[PDB]
Amino acid sequence: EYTSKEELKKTIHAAYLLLDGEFEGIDDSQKDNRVPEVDRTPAEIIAYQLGWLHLVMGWDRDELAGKPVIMPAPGYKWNQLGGLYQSFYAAYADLSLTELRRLFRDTERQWLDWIDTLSEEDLFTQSVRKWTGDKPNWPMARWIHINSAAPFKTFRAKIRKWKKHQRQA
């Protein structure tokens, strides 16, 4: 849980910067290189974030604009996450690693900008939005956490492990 919008933004941005910082020294040519120890490539690691950040911002933007929201995505049910992730990877597969990092930087800024428009009540009380559902402990802030602060930390571990196994067992 978070104490405030301020702490939420701080935590997200710190984790973003540590994640992106790991990509320094990874060559564009290495973006699709897979090692058995890590389930994702460097390209997939960023494309995964792009996919979820845009999806979640989309839910909120669409709901407020009067576009009914289908979650998680129009052609993917919650039981089809595997396919959803592949659609993320496919959508960004053409971008260089450098281009991916620039898109991720702009997208994380969009994310913080969107959060800045939310009141503390919007963030931390349930049933303000329809898309967050009505379950206790799942207000906007939780959905935001599990799609930014949390995966930015998890996927930082992933890219660090990928880098390790470029050099050693």
Numbering used by the authors: 16 to 184
Question: Which text from the study accompanies this structure?
Answer:
The precursor PdDfsB is cleaved by subtilisin to yield biologically active Slf, and the chemical gradients of both proteins between two growing colonies could be accurately modelled. However, remarkably, the dfsB gene is widely distributed across Gram-positive and to some extent Gram-negative bacterial kingdoms (PFAM entry DUF1706). PdDfsB adopts a four-helical bundle core structure that belongs to the DinB structural superfamily. The most strongly conserved region of PdDfsB is the C-terminal helix, which is present within the mature Slf sequence.
A 12-kDa polypeptide was shown to be localised exclusively to this region and is derived from a precursor protein termed DfsB (PdDfsB). PdDfsB does not follow this pattern: it is a monomer and lacks the conserved residues responsible for coordinating metal ions. Also uniquely, the C-terminal helix of PdDfsB contains a conserved proline that introduces a kink in the helix. Finally, PdDfsB displays a strong positively charge patch that is, again, absent from other DinB family members. Coupled with the fact that PdDfsB is apparently secreted and processed extracellularly, our structural data suggest that it is not an enzyme. Cleavage by subtilisin results in one of the central α-helices being removed, which would force the remaining polypeptide to collapse to a new state, or oligomerise, or bind other hydrophobic surfaces such as a lipid bilayer. The remaining sequence of Slf is shown in Fig. 1e, and it includes many conserved positive charges and aromatic residues. The pattern of conserved positive charge and aromatic positions is reminiscent of cationic antimicrobial peptides, which damage cell membranes.
